[PDB]
Amino acid sequence: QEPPPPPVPLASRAACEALKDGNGDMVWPNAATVVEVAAWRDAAPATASAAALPEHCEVSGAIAKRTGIDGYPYEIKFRLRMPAEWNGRFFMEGGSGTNGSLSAATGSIGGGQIASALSRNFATIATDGGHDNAVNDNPDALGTVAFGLDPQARLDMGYNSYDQVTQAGKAAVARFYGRAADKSYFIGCSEGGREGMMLSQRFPSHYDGIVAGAPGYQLPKAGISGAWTTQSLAPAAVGLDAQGVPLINKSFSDADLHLLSQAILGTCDALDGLADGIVDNYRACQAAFDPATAANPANGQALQCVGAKTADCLSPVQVTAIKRAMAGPVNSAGTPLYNRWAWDAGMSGLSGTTYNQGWRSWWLGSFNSSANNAQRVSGFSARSWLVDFATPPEPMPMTQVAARMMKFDFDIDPLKIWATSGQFTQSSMDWHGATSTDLAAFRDRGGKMILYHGMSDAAFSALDTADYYERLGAAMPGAAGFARLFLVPGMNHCSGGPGTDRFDMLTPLVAWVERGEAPDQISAWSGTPGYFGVAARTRPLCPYPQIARYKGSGDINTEANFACAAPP
Ligand SMILES: [Ca+2]
């Protein structure tokens, strides 16, 4: 990487193939880098779901092949694509879930977009985070979360993998093109959004522009919320699963959640000036809505049943349950362990005859099942907390996860995300958390960050991202000059819901970093406009704390008739 280049033309098939082990003398930043593929790829035409891919060099391999203390093989996989015709920009996409998979690495920009970064002639890279869902699938350690049994695999998942992969990709770019990238960009959602915030705090010089959507920047606390919502909803459950755990998925039918959503709309929709099915004034909604006293606007009666349950009311047990779940977990002293959640119409939604599953899948699960299947009851999120974030890890059969969430002790078990034990020398909050508001180094070198978060996200609370942004603004006056937050009413986790959940985040990110154009609004459209009975709906996303306000005339489904403003 330092020695003279191979005597072949740059940005060519020959320069591409010379990157493979034994085909040249490239020095990688990590001496344990093994290139397994270095292949020239012809241009690929556009498809119904993807933009055309230019002719490029594809490089894939692994870093730091080793054996974990669990006896499993571990390595950091990467896939890199460098177009023959390059715009001089470097791009890394974020992960999802607990990672463990290696994407096509064409540079996803999220927001339901058809275009990839590679389709825009970026050089693009992706990683699996340091473990492999096919290899590190341990049936005694809850499946694909099994990497949590190895301390180094935890560190790789928290920060080290993306650091190693960023360095390797930049080194390959400089060799293949003969020059370093002019600017580097990172875009991720969920776990990928946590990765973006981590990079801005831990490795500020890695990327110049960062998009962090629905960022799990306190991901080790998600399982604490999950135990809380599970125990809060259990009194409203009907029936038991095969292990005797109440069926949390039966606590609310789809029709029940739509009643809740409609009551929220009755209380909150017009607080922004327009009864359009979207709660733009989320702060005013949180101050006004209480399902224990709110009305069902369709029958004019209280949402909470006075007597027996009917299709038009929610039982007092249901109302108590969802209120407690939305309040957030606390210890015996009443101290919050995570954050509270915003009431929003995207908890439900109806398009044709299809009820929105995008909110309820996280805490409740699908209603039509005799087993628990929520992410937070027995699913991936609960499993990840036990094996990946609790220290020491707590492997167990998948049949026992839901019962463990039911017996979760909020004075004892939350401490496990701050603890170390034996060879686990860092806590999960140490290696996975990204809570720092010290972004001076990132800002001072020209870094720009766009955050976004759907209000009806049940994985991570949009209000918790807002609280981080408030802390950032207090710690760094003038923070809006380099970091802005775009909350999306009605939107669920990274996509979906009765809101404008689709948007091109890369175009304004490049404009901010390279031309100094801060995003005063970001255009967005609904992927499911049927939620509003219309063919399309476009709206501006507004920088926190602004919200969209109707101008008073014109099509309510047209972005041009809205502007960003402070709440009324
Ligand atoms: Ca409204």
Numbering used by the authors: 36 to 428, 429A, 430 to 603
Describing publication, verbatim:
PETase cleaves BHET to MHET and EG, and the soluble MHET product is further hydrolyzed by MHETase to produce TPA and EG. Overall, the structure of MHETase is most similar to that of FAEs. The structural conservation between the hydrolase domains of MHETase and PETase is striking, and despite the large insertion of ∼240 residues representing the lid domain, residues Ser225, Asp492, and His528 effectively reconstitute the catalytic triad.
A similar Ca2+ binding site was characterized for Aspergillus oryzae FaeB (AoFaeB), wherein it was hypothesized to have a role in stabilizing the lid domain. These trajectories show evidence for lid stabilization upon Ca2+ binding mainly in the immediate vicinity of the calcium binding site. The lid domain of MHETase is exceptionally large, as average lid domains in α/β-hydrolases tend to be ∼100 residues, and is more typical of a lid from tannase family members (vide infra). One of the MHETase disulfides is located at the active site, connecting cysteines (Cys224 and Cys529) adjacent to the catalytic residues (Ser225 and His528, respectively), which is conserved in tannase family members.
